[PDB]
Amino acid sequence: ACPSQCSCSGTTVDCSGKSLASVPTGIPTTTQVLYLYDNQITKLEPGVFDRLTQLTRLDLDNNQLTVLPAGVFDKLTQLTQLSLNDNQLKSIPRGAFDNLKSLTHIWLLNNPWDCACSDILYLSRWISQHPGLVFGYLNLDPDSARCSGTNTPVRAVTEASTSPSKC
Amino acid sequence: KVFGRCELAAAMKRHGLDNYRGYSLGNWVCAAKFESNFNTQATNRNTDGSTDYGILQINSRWWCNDGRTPGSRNLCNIPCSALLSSDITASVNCAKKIVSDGGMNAWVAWRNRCKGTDVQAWIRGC
């Protein structure tokens, strides 16, 4: 059953470029590919993807995401590609990528990563520990996630240049 | 078409790459050298299902249409085959888009091999 707002075909659901503020209701639980890119989604509901356990690809890029719910991707153990670039994200919740055991590609660039704040540390460590997973606008690029203002690579940020008071 | 260095420098200048967004001509020549070795028909299939095309190896996930990259965008509004032309016009127009939407930091080989060097060497004798 396709959601009203979207196009469907086999296991792909294209909800892209539809001016959406949140994830549409009624995505079949058999869905493997979910395009949500080019919308105006600011917040995801906690658990919004918990039923979509078969997702192998998810595009969330080019929205207005400011914050991600903790455990938003915890049930997505078949995800190979996740796109999060070109949002308003300042950090990744601690542990948020840990269950993504099938990941081959993630896009992180064009976000205001806030490297002054201590929440950036999970992301900094995660990128450093997964040097072949992060892609920029072209090819493989672990430095493409860049601190707002200073434009230095997130993966370079360590505990001593951060503070818990800046979050 | 495989360009010579000066031949490519000459064509990049007349397309207006010299000092585009503050990058001197030699930067773009140095980029294209490490991306394609000056060969407009360089092609590279990526693991995500995209392909890289042309002298600056522009990707079909974001920038051009090849009709075989699923969920891809066409931010430059061009067929990826236009990026294979002996006419560098489409590859220059797409590159300019990339520098603005992203700058040259998108080209990792340029960042590591070209950036901060005497890059006007790429331009000597042209």
UniProtKB/Swiss-Prot annotation, chain B:
The UniProt record lists the keyword Disulfide bond: yes
Looking up PROSITE patterns in the UniProt record yields:
GLYCOSYL_HYDROL_F22_1, GLYCOSYL_HYDROL_F22_2
Q: Any idea which UniProt keywords this protein has?
A: Allergen, Antimicrobial, Bacteriolytic enzyme, Disulfide bond, Glycosidase, Hydrolase, Secreted, Signal
Superkingdom: Eukaryota
The organs and tissues expressing this protein are described as: In the egg white and polymorphonuclear leukocytes.
Q: Which GO terms describe its cellular component?
A: cytoplasm; endoplasmic reticulum; extracellular space
- Give the enzyme's EC designation: 3.2.1.17
- Which Gene3D superfamilies is this protein grouped with? 1.10.530.10
Which GO molecular function entries does the Swiss-Prot or TrEMBL record give? beta-N-acetylglucosaminidase activity; identical protein binding; lysozyme activity
Q: Where in the cell is it found?
A: Secreted
InterPro entries named among the record's database cross-references: Glyco_hydro_22, Glyco_hydro_22_CS, Glyco_hydro_22_lys, Lysozyme-like_dom_sf
Active-site residues, as the UniProt record annotates them = 35, 52
> What's the family?
Belongs to the glycosyl hydrolase 22 family.
> Which protein is depicted?
Lysozyme C
